[PDB]
A paper describes a structure:
The heavy and light chains of the Fab are covalently linked by a disulfide bond between C219L (L indicates residues from the light chain) near the C-terminus of the CL and C134 on CH1, as evidenced by the disruption of the interchain linkage by a C219A substitution or dithiothreitol (DTT) treatment. The root-mean-square deviation (RMSD) between the two overall Fab structures is 1.8 Å over 379 Cα and between the variable regions is 0.49 Å over 210 Cα. This more relaxed CDR-H3 loop conformation appears to represent the resting, low-energy state in solution, as two different crystal forms with distinct crystal packing contacts exhibited the same conformation. Conformational rigidification of the CDRs often correlates with increased binding during affinity maturation of antibodies, due to reduced entropic cost associated with binding. This observed pre-configuration of the S9.6 CDRs is likely at least partially responsible for the high-affinity binding of S9.6 to hybrids.
The DNA-RNA hybrid–specific S9.6 monoclonal antibody is widely used to map R-loops. We demonstrate that S9.6 exhibits robust selectivity in binding hybrids over double-stranded (ds) RNA and in categorically rejecting dsDNA. To understand the specificity of S9.6 for hybrids over dsRNA and dsDNA, we solved crystal structures of the free S9.6 Fab at 2.3 Å and its complex with a 13-bp hybrid at 3.1 Å resolution. In both structures, the heavy and light chains of the Fab stabilize each other through extensive hydrophobic interactions primarily between aromatic side chains (Tyr, Phe, Trp, etc.), burying a total solvent-accessible surface area of 1783 Å2.
Author numbering:
A (entry chain H): 1 to 132, 137 to 214
B (entry chain L): 1 to 216
Amino acid sequence: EVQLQQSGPELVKPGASVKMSCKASGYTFTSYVMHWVKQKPGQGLEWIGFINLYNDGTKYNEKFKGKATLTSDKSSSTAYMELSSLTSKDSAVYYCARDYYGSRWFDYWGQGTTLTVSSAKTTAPSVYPLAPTTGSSVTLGCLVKGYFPEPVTLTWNSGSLSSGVHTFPAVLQSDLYTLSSSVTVTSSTWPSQSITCNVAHPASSTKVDK
Amino acid sequence: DVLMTQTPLSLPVSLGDQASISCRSSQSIVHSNGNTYLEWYLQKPGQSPKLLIYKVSNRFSGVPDRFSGSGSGTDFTLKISRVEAEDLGVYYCFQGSHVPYTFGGGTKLEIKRADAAPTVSIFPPSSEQLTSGGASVVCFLNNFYPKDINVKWKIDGSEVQNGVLNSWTDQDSKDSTYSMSSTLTLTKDEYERHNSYTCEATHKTSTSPIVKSFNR
């Protein structure tokens, strides 16, 4: 199966540069084209350009010439994109995506790299458990308060509990993001104080279980 | 650049209904070589886009039959014959016929469904949060429809306007409902008015607000 695994820094200062990566697996990297796509938070999709990984030729959206540089490493099947002289208008999710048949449309997409451009420093979140003995259904909470930047990943029992979860999108107030997640479990369980939501804030390298 | 205009912007559909999304390009998406490189992509909440249709009408590996694509030149349509709860998200057309390649602005597909009252749960501030000197009261309002709702926080019956943070999920992919989290943040006034913390929700499913509270 085709896999496009993206990685890269998620917080960078204005005027600085960043380089993102896209490690491809499950197909012969050097025979294809890689596209890059930008999506600002809450907005549409924008094509940045493509790189022919057989001959390293590139083609750019004019708007991104001088902002974006596409490169690749054929020995490790990894495509890169460098963004230079970043501003807040470059804050976005960036996707790489494979072109299977040519250089004109893409089938498989990476999971994206979330990039924030800002002078504010990283900030680890305070993870707080939320507990009620109310009824045969039980709802416990996980408040992830005062962190920066986006994103964070939150799970319950290492992703064991999926169905009865609502994680709410983070909200920015005080120049910090606050997220929360609730979990409702059947009577066939306990209202365990700290049923163990799993919070990860890679930007500050926090991995917490509370 | 080639303008891709998507109509409508937001499309509320009932389960089972047919859904029609249109896309019009400022220039023919017919390339010189005779090919029409017009794609449709679907982005579901919290996920990358997925290819649905390539070359105007071709369905991509594993895409249900209810998704149909048609059109020619500058007018294209994506049809979801029978809409399913998992079909919600944003649909984009995309043309790869002329550099620079361009996407439409997106059509948010939204599910119409029957009203549903919220399940409300209030929570006192964490013990750890208090040792830190803070006090956030949380209130979850889960699985309601439509998203339209108002929450009033009350402290000893009186209402507090400042210090509330609300957040809605996207539309659930199975029961087509929304959920919302409301948070009140205090520091030590939590012991000042240490009794009667109330989260009161008003939704169209009842003339009476839904109340959950605690004091001690």
